[PDB]
Amino acid sequence: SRIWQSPRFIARKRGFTVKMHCYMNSASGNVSWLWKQEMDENPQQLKLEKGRMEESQNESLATLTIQGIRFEDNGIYFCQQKCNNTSEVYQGCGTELRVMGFSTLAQLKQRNTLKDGIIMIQTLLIILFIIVPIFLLLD
């Protein structure tokens, strides 16, 4: 209607960059972002540190960039700009972020099976090393 925001879903790989664009008319002041994980159900204000999350603003295109994402960035980001001439908050429905890992199906399966094959061996040897000496020394 008045505030247009894209994209709707982003699924990157850990380490890369993400950009989110809020399209709004250049009349009613400046735009302030928000944040919402799925633990909450009411958007919170967004902090900002240089090198990580950073904001800019052209004529009628406001953007936000995050560098080197990680697993603690899986939330929905909202852009909000209230009219200073009419006093009405206008808000889009924002974006979503997901952070994928470095592995595939094939590697994971082998790693899991090797790890379990190793993990049973230590149990067997600990049982042997606790049962043999007591049976030997107890005579």
Binding site: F9, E96, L125, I126, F129
Partner: protein
């Protein structure tokens, strides 16, 4: 308003049935239609998918395949007025992820591996000392 309550993704495996919903606010006199929309500021017209199948406003889709991605949008209008439209629920699908040993993931197996290793080293030193130093004397 209510045009923000809908989630932003849905998780299904192929061959199953997904569930959506559109929380109407006009007292059982409105019209509910479900559409499938493109990226945004699109040029091709959107397509008409299906009407409200049950009184409470739920859409059910079956026979999931690879080509069933994309945004699903519910559009509701009351008679002669303009329609009200949410901003969709992106759908992402892939079936495979397997079972094995659901109890713990890699986040736990490494820790108990290292604990078992250190405990084994701790417990495999005293028996040798007891067997050896108690034999000469």
């Amino acid at each position: 308003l209510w045009m923000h309550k809908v989630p932003a993704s849905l998780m299904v495996s192929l061959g199953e049935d997904a569930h959506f919903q559109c929380p109407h606010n006009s007292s059982n006199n409105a019209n509910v239609t479900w559409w499938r929309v493109l990226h945004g500021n699109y040029t091709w017209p959107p397509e008409f998918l299906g009407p409200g199948e049950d009184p409470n406003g739920t859409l059910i889709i079956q026979n999931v395949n690879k080509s069933h991605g994309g945004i699903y949008v519910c559009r509701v209008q009351e008679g002669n007025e303009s329609y009200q439209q949410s901003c969709g629920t992106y759908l992402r699908v892939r079936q495979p992820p397997p079972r094995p040993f659901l109890d713990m993931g890699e986040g736990t197996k490494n820790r108990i591996i290292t604990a078992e290793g250190i405990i084994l080293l701790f417990c495999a030193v005293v028996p040798g000392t007891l067997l050896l130093f108690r034999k000469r004397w």
